[PDB]
Amino acid sequence: MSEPVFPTPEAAEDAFYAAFEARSLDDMMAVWARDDHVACIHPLAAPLNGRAAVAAGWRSMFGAAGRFRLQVKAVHEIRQADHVIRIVDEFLTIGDETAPRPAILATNVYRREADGWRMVLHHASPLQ
Amino acid sequence: EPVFPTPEAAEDAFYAAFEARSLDDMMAVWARDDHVACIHPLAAPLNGRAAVAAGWRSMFGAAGRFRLQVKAVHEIRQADHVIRIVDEFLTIGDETAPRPAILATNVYRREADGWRMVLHHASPLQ
Numbered sequence: 001m002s003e004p005v006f007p008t009p010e011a012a013e014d015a016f017y018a019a020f021e022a023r024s025l026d027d028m029m030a031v032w033a034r035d036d037h038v039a040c041i042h043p044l045a046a047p048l049n050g051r052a053a054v055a056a057g058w059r060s061m062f063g064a065a066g067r068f069r070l071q072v073k074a075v076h077e078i079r080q081a082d083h084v085i086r087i088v089d090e091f092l093t094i095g096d097e098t099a100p101r102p103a104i105l106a107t108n109v110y111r112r113e114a115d116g117w118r119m120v121l122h123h124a125s126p127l128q
Numbered sequence: 129e130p131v132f133p134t135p136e137a138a139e140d141a142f143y144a145a146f147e148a149r150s151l152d153d154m155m156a157v158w159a160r161d162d163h164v165a166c167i168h169p170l171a172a173p174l175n176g177r178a179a180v181a182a183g184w185r186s187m188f189g190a191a192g193r194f195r196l197q198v199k200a201v202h203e204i205r206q207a208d209h210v211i212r213i214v215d216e217f218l219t220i221g222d223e224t225a226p227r228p229a230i231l232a233t234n235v236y237r238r239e240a241d242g243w244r245m246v247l248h249h250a251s252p253l254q
Contacts, residue, residue: 037204039213044254046231047213049202076175078163078246080237083209085247087165087173105167107233107249111206120204121211123233125251128170 004030009084009110012117016108021070023062029055033111033118041123043104069093071100084110084117090124103127130156131242135210138236138243147196149188155181159237159244167249169230195219197226208238209246216250229253 006012012031019028032038032054040054041047048057071091078085086108091100109121132138138157145154155177158164162176166183174183197217204211212234217226235247 035204037202039202039204039211041213041231041233041251044252046253047202076165076173078165080163080209082206085165085235087167105172107167107247109211109235121233123249123251125167125249126170127172 005116006031006118007116009086009117012110012119013086013088013108016119016122017070017072021068023065025055025059025062028058028062031119033113033120035120038119039121041121041125043124043126067095069100075105082112084112086110089127132157132244133242135212135236135243138245139212139214139234142234142245142248143196143198147194149191149193151181151185151188154184154188157245159239159246164246166247167251169250169252192220194221195226201231210236210238210243212236215253 006015016031019031036050038051038054039047039049040057042057042061048054073089074086075089076087088106088108089103090106091103093100104124105127106122106124108119110117111120132141142157145157158180164177164180165173165175166180167173168183168187174180199215200212201215202213214232215229216232217229219226230250231253233249234245236243237246
């Protein structure tokens, strides 16, 4: 019944990464806008367009990934009243390793709504 | 100072500048403030107008000549920001077919008199 409301773009991003590390599909999809034009690009992939595609992509990644840890560092932000873009480095430590793999870059775009913020786009890419 | 009435007009100008390797025309498409960033394939981001301009100068200066074809794959339209995701097909020299597609996210912001690019994020496709 209850759906979360994120008061700021930072809260949406915090929720996004928490859902990512927990591999929680319900929590993840609560961060995304209830709009069928959302889009999600995973590293080296073509975009997943609309809620069903985005949801299938997270489901597939969460289901196959096994256990990992995630640490994130912000690199830059472009802030407007209606949309906020946050560019971040994603550091994944996989399975039984204790130092992280090379950073993955991500552009995350948050859109304001009357009562809070939601994600409309995630574009991840590797760094040479 | 050129004004672009739609995000599509700004994109057309972006790609014409890109193919012509014209830094002056390219920078005419970007917002005239530091609220901008640009990520070239496999690169870390360039933040602010000066860095973005240095990036395009560096890309245009190193690239040599190429032909460009673009195909729109997705759009997210809102009142003050529009996001276009496109496949970019570069053909280098006498090569028959184009190289594998580069995927790009472009974000346009609405200003008082037109639209301007605030972000370009390009990545390779497996």
